[model samples]
Target: MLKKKQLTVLDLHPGAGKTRRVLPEIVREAIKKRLRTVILAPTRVVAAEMEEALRGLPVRYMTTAVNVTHSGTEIVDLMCHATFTSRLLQPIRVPNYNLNIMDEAHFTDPSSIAARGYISTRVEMGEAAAIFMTATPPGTRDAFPDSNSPIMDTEVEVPERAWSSGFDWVTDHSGKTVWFVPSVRNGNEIAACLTKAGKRVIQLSRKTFETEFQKTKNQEWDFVITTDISEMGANFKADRVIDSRRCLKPVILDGERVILAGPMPVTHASAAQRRGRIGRNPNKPGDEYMYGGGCAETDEGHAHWLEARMLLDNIYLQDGLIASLYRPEADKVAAIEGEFKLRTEQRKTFVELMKRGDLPVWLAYQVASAGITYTDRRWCFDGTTNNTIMEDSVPAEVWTKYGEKRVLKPRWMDARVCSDHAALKSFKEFAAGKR
Candidate 1:
């Protein structure tokens, strides 16, 4: 075990003000030691907040690959986890800082191997200092096996309006509220359900987080959906909250499957910190919805995704294992050649299945035969047609694994997968072949 003196954790409650009170005091200590400090925030929003707080100090914010501002004096570098973790991937890209501060450090579980390695390695050296500032540190403490600690076991309380396991939380959520999800992919089906009903919603997913969060400044939203990404990032005002206790993640942890894909429950998330996510404003209403409530609809609709995903996951996992191996220097050339040849053959198979003869056109043929056509919204939205796919059409894997019984009487609305040109031209060409 590494020495614990080099590493510390600010294990306080959600509103314990570790970032505000303790952070400033620690900053001066580093400056007096004239040590460079780097702070890692959970989100771009939180990083922006930290930047705002540390004004006038020699602080630089680096959020991307190109921005390389090195230390000339006692300075602080602030960045979100995404930026810091990515930089860890390329050791050459990692910036210089003797002291490291990881805010909301509980997220360490999902971070890539390099990010975890960096912290553990720092502790191993016992020279530099690493601070794990999280209101909700794990009791398991697997993240920091040889770690340090603080206090405060409880957090903000909310009166959870625990909905039934079959309760539908997505269909008709009113008022401005925030809903926590297992993952961005899990939230998609939930968002889609509400979106179709004309409710304004935004997902704080990696691709859309910054832009969508910025949009909230001017435009009001009915629902804001997110995973752990923004759980501690923003403190916005809302009367109600919907929190899912389980956070969906794929990850093999310590040689064990921590979480499975789709909606077969979840892998990980903090117990009390999520309660901190409940809205408290003019009225400190602790209105919350929990797991076992409203999980089925999304799970049922989400089954369609795993139809393709399950098979692809097998391929990726096999590829991952193959990549982990190291060949002898002599046969390394042959090893590379064999993989490329295999990939080329696989690429040809994809062209045959996807590009050359699109699969949707064949499915569309069934829709057209019944004198009904799909919509621009992937032909799945609205009750435009009576295109019913019974038991035979439903993939058995989806039915058995995801526990989705919807395929027993699958409706068009149950599917929402789309493509750009989506077989329109190809279907048109096939239509002309009816000569």
Candidate 2:
């Protein structure tokens, strides 16, 4: 019914019965119409959960697994089918699929090969109607086909608070609780502190995930520690929830290892999700607490701290994109060409460029292709157009001698720009000595 009406995007609150109720209803209706349905999930755990929910229904369903192989026959003949990602289901071409559903659609990376595969099937191959469902929809319409538009949208406001410490807070709270930590390692630290304070605690990790999940689901533990992995799927009926000080680890860039600080304030959307995790069950009202180090007290002591908090608050209010507008295609192409030219000129001294942070992170790793280091250089210049400026500007003997001194390959000196049309044009201009 939804697909036939050309309704592609459906937005709903996090706790809405999208999977348990809405999806099953659609599947039954699809069956009555004798239509095949495909359900796409962002992760395996979610796919399994959906598969389990529809087990006793009168519909024939199969889940695509890693080792499994399927013909278009199984999908075309089935009432319902589920797959974890577009990547796995790309091969099964059911050109006549009646309704294609992408669940957790927000997680789709527009640039991913798997996403492109799905686009090709939907647009080029004659795959029939489709619907996308998510709590957090992609912020831009460009992320989906031009025919897609939001049909249903909703948001629920959850109250939130702040506390000084988890140890003090958990000691006082008497009901089951789950705390969202920045990482597993951080969760372990919080769990240890709670345990030392004579409070019962469970840290959810890869090994203990299943058991811990069940315990939390049953409200069997005093406090549950979890990471962002639990941000989306699971439900908790705790009396209170805690969010530790938000932090991100440093991301290492290239051979010289130019370290960039990863610290960022928790966005409003994330905080809302964290708050939603608490008090989900109406029978038990819940409270959310955001814990921070007591440092936001002075302007001189924490100048950017106030600014960061303001941005977080503003972000939540506007519900807008955090970054600047998307770069124009022409500028992007020019940037690629400019970087390619610079990388070629600095091939011998690439390590110095990395150390000085003069090269972008993407280009820094490409420098390793010169055989300057033993790191995996496979990704370097893989899709770049191979046209060299140094090959003509400098004598081959001098270039060869330069390469030998730095253990570099002269081949790495080729002026290789990205394969985008604008970028290729810019490279041609630079090759012809046109600025």
Candidate 3:
């Protein structure tokens, strides 16, 4: 094992642009050591925060490095990997090099497509080093690879200190509904939900969808209906965030602004993530919300995510794997260790299935039907079908064994696999003629 470093947690509130000021110092030190880095930001705003701070540094902005400005980027987008691979097959537009920095370090999980693709990119480029930076490090240290001790860690202000001042919107909109949906919705749904409730309301998804998201700024909408994307890069002054049942619990509304943040019963979101969503905006002064006693509309949905995370931890600890060897970083070797252990276990499970030919063929069909959801699916979001996500996630040996069986039935194959658009069309036409 490499020489190890101690782990320390830092609490830094990201409001305005203060976070950017610290990036250059971190990057310069990491790069000077020739230790390539990866910064995984949870949201684009955070990543942009890092890029704007570090771009002016005297380092080579080589093709080997990328500032993955957002999940929306064409080249580094998690969903665009196939197209990237196809393009690479022809001519290499960018030189594969070492080092990466992720601003949002928590999002890289076992199920995340971005995490998988990023790993693939590192393998393809033969990267020499990686550095992950984030203030809100996962409770589980094993969440990110090669994460080191944070430099200049900040304290999380006590609720009393942070909430010294309060906003009037909460006093006025106390009884109103704030609808947060898990699935992608047409703007009309928000309008309809508010209209039916007979409450004065305006729903906004994309700020560009209509001028209302901004026009209603500081003005209270009786019910606010929107997706998680709205939370990134944009801050709303609403008092309570009514998280629909789809979003995880811990993810909903936290701190002072939330009255009752929950998914409408059928939603995702674990308990803790929902709670953090509220009162995150530090701009609103003297605002604090007592965490109202928690409840889950769906019995399994809420517990399932919690269970998954716990099981992963337990498996890691049981293997007697030390957190120091997961990666060679001086810091964050602990966090990566447990995760590395779980993945190692998971791979063993996968390998057993492969050896036994016990692949879950039926689950694949159901997952295909479920497709991709922006909320729960964001866990695996790559802007592709759920089937595609599964295809990429699953090992090739299982596909080779069972894929041929499904493909033999042309109509079923066309409906199931999206490998060929024109071939599927021909198969559909042929099926119609036979019927």
Candidate 3 local lDDT, residue 434: 20
Pairs of residues at least 3 apart in sequence or in different chains that clash in candidate 1: 165-292
Per-residue C-alpha lDDT of model 3 across residues 287-316, encoded as one tens digit per residue: 222222232433232222322222233222
Model 3 alpha-carbon miss at residue 279, Å: 3.2
Over 4 Å off in model 3, which ranges?
1-21, 41-51, 58-99, 108-179, 185-191, 195-224, 230-234, 237-239, 248-283, 286-435
What TM-score would each prediction reach against the true structure? 0.54, 0.52, 0.40
Q: Write the per-residue lDDT of candidate 2 for residues 1-435, one digit (tens) a residue.
A: 444534355666665667777887877776677676666654455655776666555533454422234443433222211232222222334444567776655441211213323332443334456666656443322211111122111222211222235335356767666677655555766677677766778776433465567666554578788754465556666656566535332222322222223334343334445545654554543244444421111111121222122112111111231211112111211111112222333333333323332233234434543444423332222222332222234421211211321211222332223222333344333222233
Return the clash pairs for model 2, or none: none
Winning model by TM-score: 1
lDDT of 1 by residue, 85-178 (tens): 4344222346445788888875632232124335545555454577877665533222111111221122222112333344454444465667
> RMSD in angstroms, all models?
13.9, 15.7, 14.8
Worst 10 residues of 2 by lDDT: 324-333
Model 2: lDDT equals 0.42
